[PDB]
Amino acid sequence: GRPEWIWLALGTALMGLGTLYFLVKGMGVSDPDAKKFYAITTLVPAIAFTMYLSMLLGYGLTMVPFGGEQNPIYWARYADWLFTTPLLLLDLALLVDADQGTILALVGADGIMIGTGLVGALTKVYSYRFVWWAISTAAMLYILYVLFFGFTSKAESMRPEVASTFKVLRNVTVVLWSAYPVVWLIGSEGAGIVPLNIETLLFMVLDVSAKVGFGLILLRSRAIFG
Ligand SMILES: CCCCCCCCCCCCCCCC
Ligand SMILES: CCCCCCCCCCCC
Ligand SMILES: CCCCCCCCCCCC
Ligand SMILES: CCCCCCCCCCCC
Ligand SMILES: CCCCCCCCCCCC
Ligand SMILES: CCCCCCCCCCCC
Ligand SMILES: CCCCCCCCCCCC
Ligand SMILES: CCCCCCCCCCCC
Ligand SMILES: CCCCCCCCCC
Ligand SMILES: CCCCCCCCCC
Ligand SMILES: CCCCCCCCCC
Ligand SMILES: CCCCCCCCCC
Ligand SMILES: CCCCCCCCC
């Protein structure tokens, strides 16, 4: 009875339902281009379902000493994000036909974001937790910069309906993603202001929006068809 359990349970349910809905729709499509978007986009909440379920059952949680106390850190979030965040970037890349080398650079940056975020989360010297946070946030900002300036440029060579879908998904991504570093800084991993139960609520809202919300928008569009 960690009080955050309720949001881990709701997160589990929403990621599950979203995965099932997307699989059902995905299995029914025959267009090859649309299939690739369905495969990527169904896997996103499926992974998140597995990690939410794991946390709900008490796995992916460790205690890290800093600031003179033992602090609960959910590390399973990073195992989700490691794979889900680049898959979302891959959906955006495929929509705008990004260059292969831009994709690699973004996936690289994304692994740096998640891996330095996790190192920060497990670091025992309080000050140095923020150093890793800042490196992670830099990597995130590079990603957003590229999505905002580079991908929008590529998108403008596409038909308007593809460009328009990309722009909504870009906007969703920039708003949601930019919130994660702030939650971490003020929550249990950082300054310890916002209690773990509220923090789990906030990451559940963000996660569901960034995966299922995003997917609803992408998979209902005409832009994914060939
Ligand atoms: C040659 C121009 C280089 C531009 C340098 C920008 C550095 C700071 C970027 C901070 C990220 C902003 C993200 C924008 C996303 C909406
Ligand atoms: C206590 C919170 C968990 C709620 C679980 C709901 C499970 C799926 C509901 C299906 C209804 C559409
Ligand atoms: C219920 C779990 C579903 C996850 C399916 C997504 C994976 C797509 C693989 C690509 C098909 C060859
Ligand atoms: C083709 C490029 C491969 C890896 C690129 C990494 C991009 C910069 C990350 C900034 C982190 C602070
Ligand atoms: C007392 C020591 C000063 C601490 C330095 C803080 C620097 C903030 C820079 C943030 C980089 C993104
Ligand atoms: C002891 C004085 C240290 C003050 C450092 C402040 C400058 C932070 C630089 C961050 C640049 C990104
Ligand atoms: C609209 C944002 C409201 C921010 C709430 C501030 C949290 C203050 C905590 C006081 C510590 C006991
Ligand atoms: C035990 C909890 C005491 C502090 C309450 C602060 C709540 C912060 C929520 C801010 C939302 C952004
Ligand atoms: C004590 C109440 C236990 C109920 C657990 C419900 C979680 C279900 C996830 C769908
Ligand atoms: C929603 C589709 C089912 C995903 C199966 C994976 C379950 C592993 C949880 C530990
Ligand atoms: C007190 C330690 C500060 C050193 C942090 C330097 C990190 C820059 C790497 C990108
Ligand atoms: C301490 C109670 C205040 C927290 C409310 C947080 C609202 C988040 C909704 C997305
Ligand atoms: C990915 C770059 C690693 C830089 C490490 C700085 C941490 C020193 C406390």
From TrEMBL:
Superkingdom classification of source: Archaea
Pfam short name (any one): Bac_rhodopsin
UniProt membrane topology term: Multi-pass membrane protein
GO CC term (a single one): plasma membrane
Protein family per UniProt: Belongs to the archaeal/bacterial/fungal opsin family.
Record's keyword terms, sorted: Cell membrane, Chromophore, Membrane, Photoreceptor protein, Receptor, Retinal protein, Sensory transduction, Transmembrane, Transmembrane helix
Main location: membrane
Keyword Acetylation: no
Localization: Cell membrane
Biological processes, Gene Ontology terms: phototransduction
GO molecular function, one term: photoreceptor activity
Stored SUPFAM superfamilies: Family A G protein-coupled receptor-like
Protein name: Bacteriorhodopsin
Membrane-crossing residue ranges in chain numbering: 5-24, 36-58, 78-96, 103-124, 130-151, 172-194
UniProt keyword annotation of Transmembrane helix present: yes
Species of origin: Halobacterium salinarum (strain ATCC 29341 / DSM 671 / R1)
